[PDB]
Design a protein around this ligand. Structure first.
Ligand SMILES: CC(=O)N[C@@H]1[C@@H](O)[C@H](O)[C@@H](CO)O[C@@H]1O
Ligand SMILES: [Cl-]
Ligand SMILES: [Cl-]
Ligand SMILES: [Cl-]
Ligand SMILES: [Cl-]
Ligand SMILES: [Cl-]
Ligand code: NA
Length: 129
């Protein structure tokens, strides 16, 4: 599913990402835009042989099982396939695990390079929330 900007802010707010660990909703919407282009079905293979899955491009080296990343972890205890759903529940719950893990939203390179120290509030400007 490809989300609209305000559609995804509301689903993200609904699922409790607004100011989760002090990260305003703008940050999660900004990060989704540049990780996935708001496409739940996004998959991208990494040089290391792991794969990034879904709206927030969660990686199979640590967070999910795709059965093809040898000696990797499944710290969110999900099939990576779960992260491609129209329902973003699995991606959000795993994202809470990742952002809590010591580096916050710096775990998303696109967030650190494109959203961090920017006016992320612009990402929720206009929306009914
Ligand atoms: C929190 C998380 O898994 N984010 C991933 C990151 O791990 C991975 O290195 C990158 C691919 O280059 O995609 C996303 O940024
Ligand atoms: Cl947009
Ligand atoms: Cl914001
Ligand atoms: Cl594996
Ligand atoms: Cl949803
Ligand atoms: Cl933090
Ligand atoms: Na894995």
């Amino acid at each position: 599913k490809v989300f609209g900007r305000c559609e995804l802010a509301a689903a993200m707010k609904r699922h409790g990402l607004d100011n989760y660990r002090g990260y305003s909703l703008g940050n999660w919407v900004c990060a989704a835009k540049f990780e996935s282009n708001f496409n739940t079905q996004a998959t991208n293979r990494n040089t290391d042989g792991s794969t990034d899955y879904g709206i927030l491009q969660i990686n199979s080296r640590w967070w999910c099982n795709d059965g093809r990343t040898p000696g990797s972890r499944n710290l969110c205890n999900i099939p990576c396939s779960a992260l491609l759903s129209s329902d973003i529940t699995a991606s959000v719950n795993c994202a809470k695990k990742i952002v809590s893990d010591g580096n916050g939203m710096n775990a998303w390179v696109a967030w650190r390079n494109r959203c961090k120290g920017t006016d992320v509030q612009a990402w929720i400007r206009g929306c009914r929330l």
